[PDB]
């Protein structure tokens, strides 16, 4: 039952984040309230899911995986807070609630996003991960940083800002999505595998292919749902991309062709999972998620 | 012997070289966002935090080349913090380091992402850069420290209290709290990163180096408050009376100029008292003595 595994992942990840947010100073001040709101209230937690599902393949303990799970979700949550700001996408709705900058003001959203970024790295450097070597811990931190910064998520966000109003062609659009979305999703998978020493790293070339495909599919589905989704189901505004002239898969290719591309990427993702079930790994959660990425309505 | 003004410039040249070396391999060169990081990180600034890193590591025989990593890292964090600080939602400044601020020059969006990227870059340097005499444990401790000094327990927490204190004329203890977090934490991290580069010898010095750093840390910000009142815009690189314009809670606003000055003097008195304990173990404290003094003698 995949919806129960989602649900359980959400609960598990939220307690992980709360564990790491609890010892922080300034509890019940605006800025920290904004971090909790942005990190913990709503969300599918698909990236934590990727961390846990990857790590679980190699038999690493869930409790260990809480660290990298919470960390990728901190980067993710920070990314949404900034992405909603007036200078960026100017959204007032996210996860069925007023966005961070709307409820707490711009200054607090900005700072809460900054602080969440930093918390991702406190967690990866300070958290208990019993069976993870120092060298491996450094590799997780290195990967998360590269995936989140100008070579990954921030760099894609900048390609996205520059492509507003230009209706860039397919190759450039692929480049935007792979960076702004794909990179962090590949970091999730990679953090899961990096928790698992030699066997985890032996799976990386293939898990990489898997991650690059679901990562891109995830963003084209995000683009598709922006066009055809209900504001009430999505938790954020239908038509937000059209309204700003964002370059997207549906705007360029139309809906049918964009759905077709997302399906091609999941077919390919499934091929890469087929190679892992040959290294004796149980890919069942990673397959269910890959389907879910393009079948979901939120 | 020792000629502070040329050490300061050599440190700027060395830190800029280090920053540059870590930015060059990055993708999207000559695009608005990397232009914004380069502008905000490299064009001007005193590089006092890198000075702290270098000077501290040098006391323990640590190689300058190794120290380029933590030093560029603390300066990456510092630079990001300024870009976000000047934003219209924050301090709404149009002028820094003699030039238009990143948001005026590049747009708000580009300034937010440049800042975001510079923070991340800080952690990519500490995780990736070569640091041959530094152990894994010490590199993790460098990351953990920069992290807790940069976020809500340090610089960001400090910026949020600063923002909350606008128009609220907070008393001395709450003002000290603001300054120790928003400014102190990162200067202390520069010192800690220098010491952690030296492994065990550096760790044994931390209790004391912390006392030093805690005092120059606070001093830094009270002198920054004083300079906001009495400084020439053209010398500061930033607008005189910006604090007074936003109702910021500052040392001079609360205590007046004489008393803020005296508090800065007293904190450097204390900072140099701590450094005497380190010179007693035959560590050369002269560069940190000199910097402590420059922190309240400076006019920018
Ligand atoms: C926020 C980041 C880095 C990426 C996602 S793209 P987006 O602006 O389309 O995201 P939403 O549709 O706003 O959820
Ligand atoms: C920029 C950070 C984190 C702290 C310093 S306080 P400030 O806003 O007074 O600094 P400036 O005077 O704007 O340089
Ligand atoms: C497309 C994207 C990177 C922005 C939102 O991603 P998401 O649909 O996983 O958002 P949630 O965390 O709210 O589920
Ligand atoms: C007061 C403060 C922490 C912000 C500016 O610090 P600073 O005077 O070192 O600024 P520079 O990097 O421009 O020298
Ligand atoms: Mg958005
Ligand atoms: Mg966006
Ligand atoms: Mg979208
Ligand atoms: Mg300020
Ligand atoms: Mg300011
Ligand atoms: Mg100031």
From Swiss-Prot, chain B:
EC numbers on record: 2.5.1.10
Biological process according to GO: farnesyl diphosphate biosynthetic process; geranyl diphosphate biosynthetic process
Binding site for (2E)-geranyl diphosphate: 96, 182-183, 221, 238
Positions bound to Mg(2+) 2: 85, 91
Compartments (UniProt record): Cytoplasm
Residues involved in isopentenyl diphosphate binding: 46, 49, 78, 97
The UniProt record lists the keyword rRNA-binding: no
Reactions this protein catalyses: isopentenyl diphosphate + (2E)-geranyl diphosphate = (2E,6E)-farnesyl diphosphate + diphosphate
GO cellular component terms given for this protein: cytosol
Keyword Cell membrane: no
Pfam families the record matches: polyprenyl_synt
Enzymatic class: transferase
Entry's cofactor comment: Binds 2 Mg(2+) ions per subunit.
SUPFAM superfamilies (UniProt xref): Terpenoid synthases
Required co-factors: Mg(2+)
Binding sites annotated in the UniProt record for Mg(2+) 1: 85, 91
MF-aspect GO terms: (2E,6E)-farnesyl diphosphate synthase activity; dimethylallyltranstransferase activity; metal ion binding; prenyltransferase activity
Keyword set, alphabetical order: Cytoplasm, Isoprene biosynthesis, Magnesium, Metal-binding, Transferase
Family: Belongs to the FPP/GGPP synthase family.
Protein's name according to its UniProt entry: Farnesyl diphosphate synthase
Naturally occurring in which organism (per UniProt): Escherichia coli (strain K12)
